[PDB]
Amino acid sequence: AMKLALITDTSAYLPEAIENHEDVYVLDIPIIIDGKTYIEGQNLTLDQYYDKLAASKELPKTSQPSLAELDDLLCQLEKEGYTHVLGLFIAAGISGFWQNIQFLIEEHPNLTIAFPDTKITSAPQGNLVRNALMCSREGMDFDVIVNKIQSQIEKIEGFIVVNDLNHLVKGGRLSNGSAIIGNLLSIKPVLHFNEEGKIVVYEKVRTEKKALKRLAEIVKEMTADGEYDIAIIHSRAQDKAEQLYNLLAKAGLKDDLEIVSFGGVIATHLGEGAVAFGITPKN
Ligand SMILES: CCCCCCCC/C=C/CCCCCCCC(=O)O
Protein backbone atom coordinates (compact mmCIF):
# COMPACT_ATOMS: atom_id res chain seq x y z
CA ALA A 1 0.00 0.00 0.00
CA MET A 2 2.16 2.87 -1.33
CA LYS A 3 1.47 6.48 -0.31
CA LEU A 4 3.77 8.44 -2.58
CA ALA A 5 4.85 12.05 -2.17
CA LEU A 6 6.12 14.29 -4.92
CA ILE A 7 8.73 16.93 -4.25
CA THR A 8 9.90 19.59 -6.66
CA ASP A 9 11.06 23.19 -6.62
CA THR A 10 9.58 26.43 -7.92
CA SER A 11 11.67 26.25 -11.14
CA ALA A 12 9.32 23.49 -12.36
CA TYR A 13 6.38 24.79 -14.34
CA LEU A 14 3.44 22.78 -13.02
CA PRO A 15 0.46 21.85 -15.25
CA GLU A 16 -2.87 23.39 -14.13
CA ALA A 17 -4.34 20.00 -12.99
CA ILE A 18 -1.32 19.19 -10.75
CA GLU A 19 -0.86 22.64 -9.10
CA ASN A 20 -2.67 22.17 -5.74
CA HIS A 21 -2.45 18.39 -5.55
CA GLU A 22 -2.23 17.16 -1.97
CA ASP A 23 0.75 14.87 -2.58
CA VAL A 24 2.80 17.56 -4.33
CA TYR A 25 5.37 19.57 -2.34
CA VAL A 26 7.27 22.55 -3.78
CA LEU A 27 10.52 23.87 -2.35
CA ASP A 28 11.22 27.60 -2.84
CA ILE A 29 14.24 28.94 -4.75
CA PRO A 30 15.55 32.28 -3.45
CA ILE A 31 16.63 35.10 -5.74
CA ILE A 32 19.32 37.50 -4.52
CA ILE A 33 19.10 41.07 -5.81
CA ASP A 34 21.18 43.68 -3.94
CA GLY A 35 20.06 41.50 -1.00
CA LYS A 36 16.81 43.48 -1.58
CA THR A 37 14.05 40.94 -2.52
CA TYR A 38 14.08 37.17 -2.29
CA ILE A 39 11.19 34.71 -2.82
CA GLU A 40 8.64 34.91 -5.63
CA GLY A 41 5.07 34.68 -4.32
CA GLN A 42 5.94 35.83 -0.79
CA ASN A 43 8.36 38.68 -1.04
CA LEU A 44 8.52 39.49 -4.74
CA THR A 45 6.05 39.57 -7.63
CA LEU A 46 7.07 38.95 -11.26
CA ASP A 47 6.46 42.65 -12.08
CA GLN A 48 8.58 43.86 -9.16
CA TYR A 49 11.25 41.41 -10.31
CA TYR A 50 11.68 42.89 -13.77
CA ASP A 51 11.55 46.41 -12.34
CA LYS A 52 14.32 45.43 -9.91
CA LEU A 53 16.20 43.77 -12.78
CA ALA A 54 16.23 46.96 -14.93
CA ALA A 55 17.27 49.11 -11.93
CA SER A 56 20.25 47.13 -10.50
CA LYS A 57 23.86 47.71 -11.70
CA GLU A 58 24.84 44.21 -10.56
CA LEU A 59 23.29 40.92 -11.79
CA PRO A 60 20.94 38.96 -9.52
CA LYS A 61 21.90 35.49 -8.26
CA THR A 62 19.88 32.52 -7.14
CA SER A 63 20.61 30.01 -4.40
CA GLN A 64 19.73 26.34 -3.97
CA PRO A 65 16.51 25.55 -2.12
CA SER A 66 17.04 24.88 1.61
CA LEU A 67 18.55 21.47 2.52
CA ALA A 68 17.01 22.02 5.95
CA GLU A 69 13.56 22.56 4.42
CA LEU A 70 13.80 19.34 2.42
CA ASP A 71 15.10 17.53 5.50
CA ASP A 72 12.17 18.73 7.64
CA LEU A 73 9.67 18.01 4.83
CA LEU A 74 10.96 14.45 4.52
CA CYS A 75 10.51 13.90 8.25
CA GLN A 76 7.01 15.47 8.09
CA LEU A 77 6.01 13.17 5.21
CA GLU A 78 7.20 10.10 7.14
CA LYS A 79 4.90 10.97 10.06
CA GLU A 80 2.10 12.06 7.74
CA GLY A 81 2.11 8.35 6.68
CA TYR A 82 3.73 8.54 3.21
CA THR A 83 5.71 5.42 2.19
CA HIS A 84 7.59 6.51 -0.93
CA VAL A 85 9.07 9.77 -2.18
CA LEU A 86 10.00 10.96 -5.69
CA GLY A 87 12.06 14.16 -5.78
CA LEU A 88 12.16 15.84 -9.22
CA PHE A 89 14.30 18.96 -8.95
CA ILE A 90 16.21 21.37 -11.19
CA ALA A 91 19.03 19.89 -13.40
CA ALA A 92 22.29 18.76 -11.70
CA GLY A 93 24.14 20.63 -14.50
CA ILE A 94 22.73 24.06 -13.58
CA SER A 95 22.76 23.82 -9.76
CA GLY A 96 24.56 21.62 -7.24
CA PHE A 97 21.30 21.06 -5.38
CA TRP A 98 20.81 17.59 -6.86
CA GLN A 99 24.29 16.48 -5.77
CA ASN A 100 23.85 18.22 -2.42
CA ILE A 101 20.60 16.47 -1.46
CA GLN A 102 21.82 12.90 -2.17
CA PHE A 103 23.04 12.10 1.34
CA LEU A 104 19.50 12.71 2.58
CA ILE A 105 18.33 9.35 1.17
CA GLU A 106 20.49 7.57 3.79
CA GLU A 107 19.23 9.92 6.56
CA HIS A 108 15.56 8.87 6.13
CA PRO A 109 15.69 5.06 6.01
CA ASN A 110 11.95 4.77 6.82
CA LEU A 111 10.98 6.03 3.34
CA THR A 112 11.80 4.71 -0.11
CA ILE A 113 13.19 7.76 -1.89
CA ALA A 114 14.36 8.47 -5.42
CA PHE A 115 15.92 11.76 -6.52
CA PRO A 116 16.73 11.08 -10.22
CA ASP A 117 18.55 13.85 -12.07
CA THR A 118 15.90 15.51 -14.18
CA LYS A 119 18.50 17.24 -16.38
CA ILE A 120 15.89 19.90 -17.10
CA THR A 121 13.70 22.57 -15.52
CA SER A 122 10.64 24.73 -16.25
CA ALA A 123 7.82 22.87 -18.07
CA PRO A 124 9.39 19.46 -18.80
CA GLN A 125 10.19 19.25 -15.08
CA GLY A 126 6.55 20.01 -14.19
CA ASN A 127 5.36 17.50 -16.75
CA LEU A 128 7.53 14.85 -15.04
CA VAL A 129 5.76 15.52 -11.76
CA ARG A 130 2.38 15.26 -13.47
CA ASN A 131 3.48 12.07 -15.31
CA ALA A 132 4.64 10.37 -12.13
CA LEU A 133 1.25 11.23 -10.63
CA MET A 134 -0.81 9.54 -13.36
CA CYS A 135 1.57 6.51 -13.10
CA SER A 136 0.86 6.32 -9.37
CA ARG A 137 -2.85 6.76 -10.12
CA GLU A 138 -2.48 3.82 -12.57
CA GLY A 139 -1.35 1.34 -9.86
CA MET A 140 2.31 1.25 -10.89
CA ASP A 141 5.11 0.10 -8.52
CA PHE A 142 7.62 2.64 -7.30
CA ASP A 143 10.58 1.08 -9.19
CA VAL A 144 8.52 0.99 -12.38
CA ILE A 145 7.41 4.63 -12.01
CA VAL A 146 11.05 5.66 -11.33
CA ASN A 147 11.95 3.62 -14.37
CA LYS A 148 9.37 5.26 -16.65
CA ILE A 149 10.43 8.67 -15.41
CA GLN A 150 14.18 8.05 -15.99
CA SER A 151 13.56 6.95 -19.58
CA GLN A 152 11.30 10.03 -19.93
CA ILE A 153 14.11 12.18 -18.60
CA GLU A 154 16.07 10.77 -21.59
CA LYS A 155 13.66 12.00 -24.27
CA ILE A 156 13.08 15.47 -22.80
CA GLU A 157 14.77 18.29 -24.72
CA GLY A 158 15.20 21.97 -23.94
CA PHE A 159 16.35 24.50 -26.54
CA ILE A 160 16.89 28.23 -25.93
CA VAL A 161 17.63 31.44 -27.76
CA VAL A 162 18.50 34.33 -25.52
CA ASN A 163 18.45 38.04 -26.10
CA ASP A 164 21.75 38.73 -24.34
CA LEU A 165 24.28 36.22 -23.14
CA ASN A 166 25.69 38.02 -20.08
CA HIS A 167 23.19 36.35 -17.78
CA LEU A 168 24.12 32.90 -19.02
CA VAL A 169 27.88 33.54 -19.11
CA LYS A 170 28.38 35.56 -15.91
CA GLY A 171 25.70 33.63 -13.99
CA GLY A 172 27.76 30.65 -15.10
CA ARG A 173 25.14 28.21 -16.41
CA LEU A 174 26.47 28.34 -19.97
CA SER A 175 29.36 25.85 -19.96
CA ASN A 176 32.85 27.16 -20.87
CA GLY A 177 31.00 30.49 -21.33
CA SER A 178 33.79 32.90 -20.48
CA ALA A 179 36.02 31.13 -23.04
CA ILE A 180 33.43 31.11 -25.85
CA ILE A 181 31.52 34.38 -25.19
CA GLY A 182 33.62 36.51 -27.60
CA ASN A 183 32.52 34.23 -30.46
CA LEU A 184 28.80 34.31 -29.71
CA LEU A 185 28.27 38.03 -29.06
CA SER A 186 27.59 39.11 -32.68
CA ILE A 187 25.23 36.25 -33.43
CA LYS A 188 22.08 34.46 -32.18
CA PRO A 189 23.15 30.96 -31.04
CA VAL A 190 20.76 28.10 -30.37
CA LEU A 191 21.49 26.50 -26.99
CA HIS A 192 20.30 23.26 -25.47
CA PHE A 193 20.65 20.88 -22.53
CA ASN A 194 23.47 18.30 -22.66
CA GLU A 195 23.37 14.58 -22.03
CA GLU A 196 24.65 15.76 -18.58
CA GLY A 197 21.91 18.39 -18.42
CA LYS A 198 24.37 21.26 -18.98
CA ILE A 199 23.57 24.22 -21.13
CA VAL A 200 25.85 24.17 -24.17
CA VAL A 201 25.73 25.78 -27.61
CA TYR A 202 23.81 23.60 -30.01
CA GLU A 203 24.30 25.74 -33.14
CA LYS A 204 25.78 29.10 -34.24
CA VAL A 205 22.90 30.87 -35.99
CA ARG A 206 23.57 34.33 -37.34
CA THR A 207 20.18 36.08 -37.21
CA GLU A 208 17.22 36.09 -34.80
CA LYS A 209 14.86 35.30 -37.72
CA LYS A 210 16.85 32.21 -38.66
CA ALA A 211 17.27 31.40 -34.97
CA LEU A 212 13.52 31.09 -34.45
CA LYS A 213 13.03 29.24 -37.74
CA ARG A 214 15.84 26.89 -36.73
CA LEU A 215 14.06 26.25 -33.37
CA ALA A 216 10.86 25.18 -35.20
CA GLU A 217 12.89 22.83 -37.40
CA ILE A 218 14.58 21.35 -34.32
CA VAL A 219 11.22 20.62 -32.67
CA LYS A 220 10.19 18.70 -35.78
CA GLU A 221 13.36 16.59 -35.61
CA MET A 222 13.21 15.99 -31.88
CA THR A 223 9.53 14.96 -31.84
CA ALA A 224 9.79 12.53 -34.76
CA ASP A 225 10.15 9.51 -32.47
CA GLY A 226 6.92 9.71 -30.45
CA GLU A 227 4.19 11.76 -28.83
CA TYR A 228 5.37 14.87 -26.97
CA ASP A 229 3.92 17.63 -24.85
CA ILE A 230 5.51 20.81 -26.32
CA ALA A 231 6.03 24.08 -24.43
CA ILE A 232 7.17 27.44 -25.75
CA ILE A 233 8.57 29.37 -22.81
CA HIS A 234 9.68 33.00 -22.67
CA SER A 235 10.87 35.72 -20.31
CA ARG A 236 8.77 38.68 -21.56
CA ALA A 237 9.30 37.74 -25.24
CA GLN A 238 5.63 37.46 -26.25
CA ASP A 239 6.35 38.21 -29.91
CA LYS A 240 9.25 35.73 -30.19
CA ALA A 241 7.01 33.00 -28.70
CA GLU A 242 3.95 33.75 -30.90
CA GLN A 243 6.33 33.71 -33.86
CA LEU A 244 7.73 30.31 -32.89
CA TYR A 245 4.16 29.17 -32.16
CA ASN A 246 3.16 30.08 -35.71
CA LEU A 247 6.24 28.39 -37.18
CA LEU A 248 5.17 25.26 -35.27
CA ALA A 249 1.51 25.79 -36.15
CA LYS A 250 2.49 25.83 -39.83
CA ALA A 251 4.61 22.70 -39.34
CA GLY A 252 1.55 20.74 -38.07
CA LEU A 253 2.45 20.72 -34.34
CA LYS A 254 -0.23 23.09 -32.91
CA ASP A 255 -2.02 20.35 -30.96
CA ASP A 256 0.24 19.76 -27.95
CA LEU A 257 1.60 23.31 -27.99
CA GLU A 258 1.32 25.71 -25.06
CA ILE A 259 2.87 29.11 -24.34
CA VAL A 260 4.12 29.64 -20.77
CA SER A 261 6.38 32.07 -18.94
CA PHE A 262 9.61 31.81 -16.98
CA GLY A 263 9.79 33.11 -13.39
CA GLY A 264 12.53 35.25 -11.80
CA VAL A 265 14.64 32.19 -11.08
CA ILE A 266 15.24 31.39 -14.79
CA ALA A 267 14.93 35.02 -15.97
CA THR A 268 17.93 35.67 -13.67
CA HIS A 269 20.09 33.23 -15.69
CA LEU A 270 18.59 33.71 -19.13
CA GLY A 271 17.97 37.46 -19.05
CA GLU A 272 14.84 39.21 -20.28
CA GLY A 273 13.86 38.68 -23.92
CA ALA A 274 14.71 34.93 -23.83
CA VAL A 275 12.68 32.29 -25.75
CA ALA A 276 12.91 28.49 -25.41
CA PHE A 277 11.07 25.29 -26.02
CA GLY A 278 10.85 22.12 -23.96
CA ILE A 279 9.43 18.74 -24.98
CA THR A 280 8.31 15.87 -22.77
CA PRO A 281 7.13 12.39 -23.78
CA LYS A 282 3.44 11.77 -23.25
CA ASN A 283 2.64 9.48 -20.36
C1 LIG B 1 12.94 24.00 -21.48
C2 LIG B 1 14.09 24.38 -20.55
C3 LIG B 1 14.50 25.84 -20.71
C4 LIG B 1 14.89 26.46 -19.36
C5 LIG B 1 16.35 26.91 -19.28
C6 LIG B 1 16.72 27.20 -17.83
C7 LIG B 1 18.13 27.74 -17.67
C8 LIG B 1 18.28 28.69 -16.49
C9 LIG B 1 19.13 28.11 -15.37
C10 LIG B 1 18.63 28.17 -13.98
C11 LIG B 1 19.58 28.13 -12.78
C12 LIG B 1 18.86 28.50 -11.48
C13 LIG B 1 19.43 27.67 -10.33
C14 LIG B 1 18.87 27.96 -8.92
C15 LIG B 1 19.77 27.36 -7.83
C16 LIG B 1 20.92 28.28 -7.44
C17 LIG B 1 22.27 27.58 -7.61
C18 LIG B 1 23.44 28.33 -6.97
O1 LIG B 1 23.81 29.48 -7.33
O2 LIG B 1 24.08 27.76 -6.05
Side-chain angles (χ1 to χ4, degrees), residues 1-15 17-18 20-33 35 38-55 58-137 139-209 211-283:
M2 163 177 79
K3 180 149 152 267
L4 170 71
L6 261 100
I7 301 86
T8 184
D9 51 58
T10 62
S11 86
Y13 186 99
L14 294 178
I18 276 352
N20 292 343
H21 192 283
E22 61 177 44
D23 298 326
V24 174
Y25 303 81
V26 192
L27 274 32
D28 300 324
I29 303 176
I31 90 156
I32 316 148
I33 321 270
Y38 263 60
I39 296 166
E40 204 170 341
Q42 163 164 40
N43 194 200
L44 174 89
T45 78
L46 194 70
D47 266 282
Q48 274 182 355
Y49 171 81
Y50 281 106
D51 278 334
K52 279 197 154 165
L53 190 54
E58 202 80 39
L59 288 175
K61 308 198 73 125
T62 57
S63 64
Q64 291 165 47
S66 171
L67 293 173
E69 283 198 341
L70 181 42
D71 184 46
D72 299 325
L73 183 57
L74 284 187
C75 175
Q76 198 52 38
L77 294 159
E78 181 176 314
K79 50 201 207 197
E80 235 150 50
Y82 287 87
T83 65
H84 298 75
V85 175
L86 189 59
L88 294 176
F89 309 105
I90 188 150
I94 66 173
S95 195
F97 185 61
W98 183 87
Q99 204 151 128
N100 278 314
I101 57 167
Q102 292 312 293
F103 79 107
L104 284 189
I105 299 158
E106 269 44 69
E107 310 284 340
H108 296 264
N110 288 109
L111 300 150
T112 298
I113 304 162
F115 293 148
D117 178 17
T118 66
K119 299 184 186 171
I120 204 70
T121 191
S122 180
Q125 212 192 322
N127 288 169
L128 286 172
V129 172
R130 193 273 311 278
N131 291 2
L133 255 65
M134 315 168 70
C135 285
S136 165
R137 219 141 148 193
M140 219 185 291
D141 282 323
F142 189 74
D143 289 5
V144 185
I145 295 183
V146 174
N147 232 274
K148 193 160 165 87
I149 292 285
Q150 259 151 12
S151 74
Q152 272 184 16
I153 282 149
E154 302 302 276
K155 311 302 277 181
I156 285 154
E157 299 292 331
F159 284 71
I160 326 150
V161 168
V162 304
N163 196 230
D164 85 311
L165 289 140
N166 310 285
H167 294 254
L168 268 180
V169 172
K170 270 179 269 205
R173 318 289 151 161
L174 178 62
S175 338
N176 195 32
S178 53
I180 58 171
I181 181 183
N183 291 332
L184 313 169
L185 276 181
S186 275
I187 62 151
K188 277 278 179 318
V190 185
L191 310 161
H192 80 320
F193 278 72
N194 250 354
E195 289 168 50
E196 300 108 50
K198 284 204 177 64
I199 314 185
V200 308
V201 185
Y202 183 73
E203 201 172 315
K204 282 180 105 201
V205 179
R206 281 188 66 262
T207 174
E208 191 234 61
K209 271 173 279 292
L212 297 173
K213 289 207 279 149
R214 195 76 199 93
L215 283 175
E217 285 160 20
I218 289 173
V219 174
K220 201 173 201 183
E221 288 194 0
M222 301 290 128
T223 61
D225 62 348
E227 296 281 305
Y228 292 85
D229 288 309
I230 317 165
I232 305 161
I233 319 135
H234 68 97
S235 57
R236 300 246 182 117
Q238 194 61 31
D239 280 347
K240 317 211 316 178
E242 289 184 345
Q243 165 67 10
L244 181 48
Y245 183 90
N246 296 329
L247 292 164
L248 289 182
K250 184 176 184 173
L253 303 161
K254 189 210 276 177
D255 287 308
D256 305 290
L257 199 56
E258 197 185 19
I259 302 165
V260 296
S261 280
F262 293 115
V265 175
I266 300 163
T268 296
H269 296 273
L270 253 50
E272 181 164 3
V275 81
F277 72 80
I279 74 177
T280 307
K282 283 187 197 188
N283 212 53

